[PDB]
Scaffold this active site. Structure first.
Site, short mmCIF file in Angstrom:
data_model
loop_
_atom_site.label_atom_id
_atom_site.label_comp_id
_atom_site.label_asym_id
_atom_site.label_seq_id
_atom_site.Cartn_x
_atom_site.Cartn_y
_atom_site.Cartn_z
N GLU A 63 0.78 -1.20 0.08
CA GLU A 63 0.08 -0.16 -0.08
C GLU A 63 0.86 1.22 -0.30
OE1 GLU A 63 -3.17 0.23 -0.57
OE2 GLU A 63 -3.86 -1.49 -0.35
N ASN A 115 -7.76 8.93 -6.03
CA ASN A 115 -8.46 8.06 -7.12
C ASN A 115 -9.35 8.59 -8.08
OD1 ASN A 115 -8.78 6.47 -3.84
ND2 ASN A 115 -7.60 5.64 -5.54
N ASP A 149 -12.41 8.34 -8.55
CA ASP A 149 -13.86 8.92 -7.85
C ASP A 149 -13.77 10.15 -7.22
OD1 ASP A 149 -12.72 8.12 -5.37
OD2 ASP A 149 -14.33 6.36 -4.91
N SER A 203 -11.96 10.49 -4.54
CA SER A 203 -11.34 10.28 -2.93
C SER A 203 -9.70 10.19 -2.93
CB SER A 203 -12.11 8.97 -2.46
OG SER A 203 -11.69 7.89 -3.12
N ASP A 229 -6.45 8.36 -0.72
CA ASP A 229 -6.00 7.18 0.17
C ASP A 229 -4.79 7.98 0.92
OD1 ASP A 229 -7.66 5.20 -0.91
OD2 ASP A 229 -6.22 4.66 -2.32
N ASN A 260 -9.17 5.26 2.65
CA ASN A 260 -9.78 6.16 1.86
C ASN A 260 -10.62 7.10 2.69
OD1 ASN A 260 -12.34 6.23 -0.46
ND2 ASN A 260 -10.28 6.34 -1.30
N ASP A 310 -15.38 -4.91 8.69
CA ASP A 310 -16.69 -4.32 7.98
C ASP A 310 -17.34 -5.44 7.37
OD1 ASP A 310 -18.00 -1.91 7.33
OD2 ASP A 310 -17.46 -2.33 5.39
#
Length: 129
Positions: A35, A46, A48, A50, A52, A59, A101
């Site tokens: 990562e 990203n 979209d 967003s 990270d 995110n 989650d």
């Protein structure tokens, strides 16, 4: 901060990630390697809109607030900047919520593609834990 491999293993163990939700410490070290390359300051935008953040590339849409992300939920109740600290506490607390989650460590696409199924124990081999 750029952690050493065994240094990060020891910090993750101290903060209770070894076998958290059944994921051995090598899984968490492997995820951080791919990562962020163990760099707390890593950021990645990203498509979209967003971003990270940090050693586990958490995110800004679901997890942390950066002030510029559409559909922001801030489920970790933390500024994304807290995830860039030399102190990994915020990253570890938020990772514990993420991995809880429903999809386990598949939440981290780099973990699924580069760590899952592999000899992850190699990531803590040689370390004084």
């Amino acid at each position: 901060k750029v952690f050493g491999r065994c240094e990060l293993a020891a910090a993750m163990k101290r903060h209770g990630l070894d076998n958290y939700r059944g994921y051995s410490l090598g899984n968490w070290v492997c995820a951080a390697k791919f990562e962020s390359n163990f760099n707390t300051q890593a950021t990645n935008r990203n498509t979209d809109g967003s971003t990270d953040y940090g050693i586990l590339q958490i995110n800004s849409r679901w997890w942390c607030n950066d002030g510029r992300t559409p559909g922001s939920r801030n489920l970790c109740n933390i500024p994304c900047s807290a995830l860039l600290s030399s102190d990994i506490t915020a990253s570890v607390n938020c990772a514990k919520k993420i991995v809880s989650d429903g999809n386990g460590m598949n939440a981290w696409v780099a973990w699924r593609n580069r760590c899952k199924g592999t000899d992850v124990q190699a990531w803590i081999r040689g370390c004084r834990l």
